[PDB]
Symmetry: C2
Subunit: 940 residues, 2 copies
């Protein structure tokens, strides 16, 4: 009433700063210029030709009117204020930790570190590649195992990956996987959820009493246990090996500064979280999980691995080596965890752990004086305290009164996990809470004389860790600042130039969106804090669920899955559970078009489905006749079709509705991979044209930053008939991520984007993304054939450039073009996917016309360079394309013996003389790196 | 008791992360190595031999025990939470504003922008130089005037600089300066405080009724006025010109998007604050003030000015221009005492202009003006009297004596502050943050009820937002490409990144600038600056809303008092220059208070910072230099002679300790005794306090007053040339005269606590270091300086040493032999260091032909050694010239710095290789910092002064 009147009045005022105009690259003038090159007068008219009318969303999105950056921040701040920041000593896999301010400011809040994506182009990613090498080295050193990857999604899924690895190398008919009952309970549920569709039996029980009567292929043990107890696992491991099973330890990596590590205990695999290496609690994430194992299983390892190779000049250089459904991981958070190791060093890390342990021993001695029973013989940071059923509720409440959360274990027992933030003053609060009064029957300092903090020799670590120079040389703040800056300077990120990676949506990660991630009311909340303290998050989730529901047209949203791969997997699990609920167990066929992202069939197989490929036609589109024939053939067994819309070829197929009808006719569900949603928002809705479930990549379409290769979030939307089966936050599939809302803290980014854009702005973004892709295609089409065009000769949000003629004409490979683009100051687009020998270019709506033109001009110049080779005008082996990228040192030092000038090499376009980005290394030898796998700092 | 018990227990625990170990560069092993090189068994021995045992502080500093970064942040957050963030519509020269998040994150919270200092080495400072050029251009465009500088400290002091300029160019014998009574009241006080020691008569009155009967040399008018009124000042300006006076307008630069600008009105000078170009309120600062005037007054402009020149390759390049105006060359004859200014905030303000452009800026002002007109119409419906005929953002509302307190109280109940004007009148200033919902609150507060006799939208059809033709601006502004090209966030992100990449700051390598103390600006120290509880408070908010700041100030006053030994501390002065000036003002007031008005002689040793004699002249004192002896020390005999001669007239001695020569003189106590014997006060320049903290205290060895540079010794970042804070400590007998926060000197800074928000940085430093840590920092600073001197002494003579052949926290390297032997100039060495990846140390000050090197305690041994190795390599390059082994005119020293383009493009015709040019040391092959331009032609730039984007 009064509010409606204010909105009228506000609309009369001079126009205010609109976030849409900061998010978009091309303004109205630039848009009109682009449209004219395309032969359209208006964007609306172009979009009417791009999007098939039958699937066009016929109205505006029902979303809140856009807010300014200032207003949206203020609104979210009021929501955030409803959360309460307690001292949580809940433990269970998440422990408060101190992020060194220098790392918070210069990595987590630095777009130079969070805006690039996976280091596909290694020569311009040596900085984050080195940080990841440090991460691998830290994990190898602490676990005592031979190889480690460049991070997994969270502790529980890493453990599930360990189960899968163990299953693969098993040669027995053993179908059971033993999980110790004192693993973290969310880990157990994630494992059970992954085991279900594969028919794997999960046996959960006390490791002490496991009989080894039932054949197992693997076992998972928690170290220290979830209730805190530190056990000697050697005997169990020995017995498991006698029964041909691999043993995985889920091991707290901070505890491994003190405790005998998994490698020395005989464990085959180690997993865990690196969250307490200075990564915010985040109400669940994002945190990098680790995965370490024996070198003999290196070809079986999940995820990405950084390896040391050499460049064209013989110098050391890093690359992803040996290239599960996992794609996007947790790179940014692995960088933070490794920098925590670099800044603290081995001595510093051990002192942090020793202090935590000393405080926990002191805590225990005082609780004993208060006549409580202490169950753990040995512990790192976590006590199991027997208080009796009568006292447990009052203690937990008194604790809450002081803003402290403890862990309820079983009736009459309370768990307490201390951490890096804990002070002697916190200890006093704990004693007084347990005493029920403030005057204690002891003095704090009096207890120190009793403090015995050693472990038995069988559990006392002697081996060293983090001995490489990198962990010793950068302990002043100034030193670390400079190290970070040097690594950052090697990497080409979005603060330098457009990174037009097809299938990745490298759009603006706006400062206003990123800001709230590091507000303590979002970042400093334990994922299992009582609901009464997380009402701000509850509001955030409810809003995001409603908004993503409206965008997709689905009736329910699960925010849990913490990657695109996880969303696909969750979606297929929900479909599987649906068929089971109808008494249709035999439905296990998953139809997948050959063009699909590789995550799709990997996810299907993980879900116990049998993949049946569906041909794509001569235009690159889904072959409807073939789909119909396969659907008919597998009618009784059809579980699902997984479809990407628009296709991985960047095309709006007009047949999508018909395709869904066919699948439904034969009893299947339709799953839509939502990676290409940047061509859809406001223009079509998956639920409307026949999808039953989809996932969204929030790190593509909805602005979560690419993080150098992570983090992401992959929420799913489902129709009502599937809602009952959604992951838990009688019928649920269980848990897909370790935390109920996955990496909850980064969800604020997509909330901010939607709040600041509003329904018209979100739709305009989609439209401009399509305009810019089509503009680039039109500019380049006479130089590089555009491989797949939709109806009306338009593409969607990306286009595929055919580089195969250059190979025929000039013996030039796509890799040569990709490296030569570095000399022009550009990261290459997506290379050789989905079609070998091509590039897929996706500019997004956030890049200016000037930037688009520079990229096209670079490609045209490279076209002319290839023509020169074709026409014999320059040596076919010694030319800028074959020798790219050109380092400054290669141009300045030694003799210059090439048939082109140093200026032609380094400044091939005018903009490079205004600002030059220097490739840090020459072209990296890929085959050499895979042949001689070196994955730690020892090799560099 | 219980805390005592806990402290005891905590000491038993494994060592936690100590901030001291992050702040220091050299650890214990590195320190032992450096001591071995120096021939000392312990650091204690070195310090006992460096510091005269007589002035030595005989106990530990009484300061709180060190806290971790985590604990100190928590403690300050608790303090900050006591402040209340209101919607302040108080105005008076400070208005809430929206800092674009992209600028907050990538400039204000980016050490790449805030760690370097004044762009003395222009070739490695083109980024901030360009941002300053944009600032000047924005100011010129908006004011309609011909030249503008690269910032002043605040609005009131800028107006005082305008008074000084007007006095300096006056054709008459006029001694009076007219100040309109509707200038901001703090501006009036700053002006009066500056006029007092110069004997200038300040007339404060209604500009409408000024008779011009008393001759004036200048007039200051406020536009719009402090109460909001917009006046047509043309007639006044014409009359002032008829009477041979200059007119300065203190003009709100946002309002100039709509209002006819000073230049077009005929004004000679414009000053103001650029705070509302996206700079946090900051409880007073820091904000860059602007100063614009006519080209014909170039040589009299205060402060720094960026000018477009060209480099060795004929390419456009920027540099500081007309430097003989400034204190470091000209000293007592400088145009002002200003040194450190507000560069970081000028960068932010110009980026606000770049991001919003002319259209965006105008829309911000239009919307503010529309909201204010709407507010006005509503208040009239409620039967209130509205006094301003025309206004931009500020209303003067007649409410009556009886209602005014209740309205103010009701506003406070909704978390709103208004401005008390006079009894029965209330001021309201709207700003960029204001929404129609805020309007509704204001109307309901004035209505005394929630249901209004009108609806908001209904009022719109009555809104006239235009001004009379004679006040309506027609001229364009910000038409240069730079203000149009970077409006997407991604574009601005990239522009900022490209500029930042051109500049060598502390995230690259050590910048060992003597007299500057380029130590760690720790992230934890910087973090609280941008907490809203510090950044979003209006400086004239009611005391009940600022208890967190009260606590911060009390603690800082106590701690700096303990460090200096002084009885009272003033946190007001907002630069070292202001601290000196405030100190001299208090000394002057003291002599007057004793009935000793004739004391106006200020003794100043020849080595002193140019700010010293400049400050003295501004304080109405006559400078008498005191000679330095053969060994560079103050000549006690000469001091005594002059003290005797000017006995009856001796006001002060200004002394820097340790000296600007980097030496601890053992005579400092005797020197103070002599000054006191002859009736003078002793002022100590505390810019070298990084050699003193915990080791000696100025008050203990004879100083009556000192200033500290928090941006040198206490970690406020150098900001590319600002901001700073220059608090003063005084003995009890001077306390009565301190600036207002019957006897006060008045106001030195426009805001009572100057740039209050940045004081949290120094609070954090002290809290995290503790007494032993602060003292260790001083000792390591001295160790590292002596280490570098020892390493370099056989190559470059150490010009001055103290007792036991030691230096203090810095040393002077004599490069004059290189000039004699090889015709190598100090600037040659400075540019060649760029090719080694280093910013030069301080060049040619205090001694021409030398370099003064100050590493600070924050730089590692490895880094100290690389710098020494660079200087040694350069020495060998000079020796090759000397021995005739290379063309004396064509060699790396003469041609430095070497851009990548100069090496890669075109034919290479030099008797040395490109590798020798770009990679003269092995670390450059690990990480190469590229100079963005070749050597800049200085004389060409001063000959053809171009100070806006049109030239570049």
């Amino acid at each position: 009433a009064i509010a409606v009147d204010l909105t009228k009045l506000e609309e009369k005022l001079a126009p205010a700063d609109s976030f849409l105009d900061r998010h978009l690259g091309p303004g109205e003038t630039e848009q009109r210029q682009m449209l004219q090159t395309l032969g359209f007068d208006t964007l609306g008219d172009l979009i009417d030709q791009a999007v098939p009318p039958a699937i066009r969303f016929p109205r505006s999105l029902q979303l809140p009117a856009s807010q300014s950056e200032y207003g949206a921040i203020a609104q979210l701040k009021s929501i955030a204020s409803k959360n309460q920041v307690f001292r949580s000593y809940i433990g269970m896999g998440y422990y408060d930790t101190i992020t060194p301010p220098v790392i918070q400011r210069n990595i987590l809040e630095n777009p130079g570190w969070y805006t690039a994506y996976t280091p596909y182009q290694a020569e311009i990613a040596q900085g984050r590649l080195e940080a990841l090498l440090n991460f691998q080295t830290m994990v190898m050193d602490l676990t005592g195992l031979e190889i480690a990857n460049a991070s997994l999604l969270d502790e529980g899924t890493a453990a599930a990956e360990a189960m899968a690895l163990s299953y693969g190398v098993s040669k027995s008919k053993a179908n059971a996987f033993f999980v110790a009952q004192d693993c973290h309970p969310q880990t157990i549920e994630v494992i059970k959820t992954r085991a279900n569709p594969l028919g794997i039996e999960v046996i959960v029980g006390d490791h002490h009493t496991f009989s080894f009567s039932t054949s197992i292929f693997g076992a998972l043990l928690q170290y220290p246990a979830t209730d805190g107890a530190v056990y000697d696992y050697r005997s169990f491991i020995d017995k498991a090996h006698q029964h041909q099973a691999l043993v995985t330890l889920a091991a707290d990596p901070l505890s491994l500064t003190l405790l005998t590590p998994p490698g020395e205990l005989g464990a085959d695999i180690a997993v865990g979280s690196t969250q307490r290496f200075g990564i915010p609690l985040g109400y669940g994430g994002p945190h990098a999980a680790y995965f370490a194992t024996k070198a003999e299983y290196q070809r079986k390892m999940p995820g990405r691995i950084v390896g040391v190779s050499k460049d064209a000049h013989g110098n050391p250089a890093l690359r992803l080596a040996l290239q599960s459904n996992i794609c996007t991981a947790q790179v940014l958070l692995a960088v933070m965890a490794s920098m925590y190791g670099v800044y603290h060093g081995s001595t510093g890390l051990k002192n942090i752990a020793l202090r935590i342990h000393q405080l926990t021993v002191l805590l225990a001695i005082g609780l004993k004086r208060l006549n409580y029973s202490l169950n753990n013989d040995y512990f790192f940071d976590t006590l199991r305290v027997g208080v009796g059923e009568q006292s447990a509720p009052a203690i937990l409440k008194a604790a809450e009164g002081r803003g402290i959360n403890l862990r309820p274990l079983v009736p009459g027992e309370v768990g307490i996990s201390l951490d890096e933030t804990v002070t002697v003053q916190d200890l006093l609060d704990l004693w007084q809470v347990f005493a029920g009064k403030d005057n204690l029957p002891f003095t704090p300092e009096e207890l120190w004389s009793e403090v015995k903090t050693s472990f038995p020799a069988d559990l006392t670590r002697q081996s060293l860790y983090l001995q490489d120079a990198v962990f010793n040389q950068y302990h002043s703040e100034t030193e670390l600042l400079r190290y970070l800056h040097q690594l950052e300077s090697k990497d080409l990120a979005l603060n330098t130039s457009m990174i037009p990676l097809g299938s990745c949506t490298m759009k603006l990660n706006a400062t206003a969106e990123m800001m709230p991630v590091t507000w303590p009311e979002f970042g400093k909340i334990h994922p299992f804090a009582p609901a009464g303290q997380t009402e701000g998050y509850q509001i955030l989730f409810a809003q995001l669920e409603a908004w993503l529901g409206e965008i997709t047209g689905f009736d329910a949203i699960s925010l849990q899955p913490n990657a695109g791969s996880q969303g696909e997997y969750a979606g297929l699990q929900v479909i599987r559970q649906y068929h089971l609920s109808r008494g249709e167990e035999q439905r296990n066929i998953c139809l997948i078009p050959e063009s699909a992202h590789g995550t799709n069939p990997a996810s299907a197989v993980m879900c116990g489905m049998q993949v049946v490929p569906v041909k794509c036609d001569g235009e690159g589109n889904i072959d409807v006749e073939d789909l119909t024939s396969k659907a008919e053939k597998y009618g009784d067994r059809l579980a699902a079709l997984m479809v990407t819309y628009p296709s991985t070829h960047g095309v709006f197929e007009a047949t999508i509705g018909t395709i869904c009808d066919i699948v439904h006719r034969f009893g299947g569900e339709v799953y839509m991979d939502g990676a290409n949603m940047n061509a859809q928002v406001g223009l079509c809705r998956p639920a409307d044209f026949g999808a039953d479930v989809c996932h969204l990549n929030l790190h593509k379409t909805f602005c979560i930053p690419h993080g150098g290769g992570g983090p992401g979030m992959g929420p799913i939307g489902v129709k009502s008939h599937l809602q009952a089966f959604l992951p838990r936050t009688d019928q649920s599939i269980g848990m897909i991520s370790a935390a109920p809302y996955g990496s909850a803290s980064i969800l604020v980014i997509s909330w901010m984007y939607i709040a600041m854009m509003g329904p018209q702005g979100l739709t305009k973004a989609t439209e401009v993304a399509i305009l810019s892709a089509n503009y680039m295609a039109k500019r380049l089409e006479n130089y590089y054939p555009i491989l797949f065009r939709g109806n009306n000769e338009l593409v969607a949000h990306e286009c595929i450039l055919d580089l195969r003629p250059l190979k025929k004409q000039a013996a030039i490979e796509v890799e040569d073009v990709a490296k030569r683009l570095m000399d022009f100051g550009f990261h290459a687009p997506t290379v050789s996917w989905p079609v070998l020998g091509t590039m897929m270019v996706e500019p997004t709506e956030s890049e200016s016309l000037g930037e688009l033109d520079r990229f096209c001009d670079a490609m045209i110049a490279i076209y002319q360079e290839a023509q020169a080779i074709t026409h014999g005008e320059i040596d076919p082996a010694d030319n800028p394309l074959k020798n790219a990228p050109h380092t400054a040192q290669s141009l300045i030092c030694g003799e210059w013996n090439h048939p082109y000038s140093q200026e032609e090499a380094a400044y091939p376009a005018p903009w490079t003389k205004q600002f030059k980005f220097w490739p840090a290394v020459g072209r990296i030898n890929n085959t050499y790196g895979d042949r001689h796998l070196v994955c730690s700092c020892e090799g560099m």
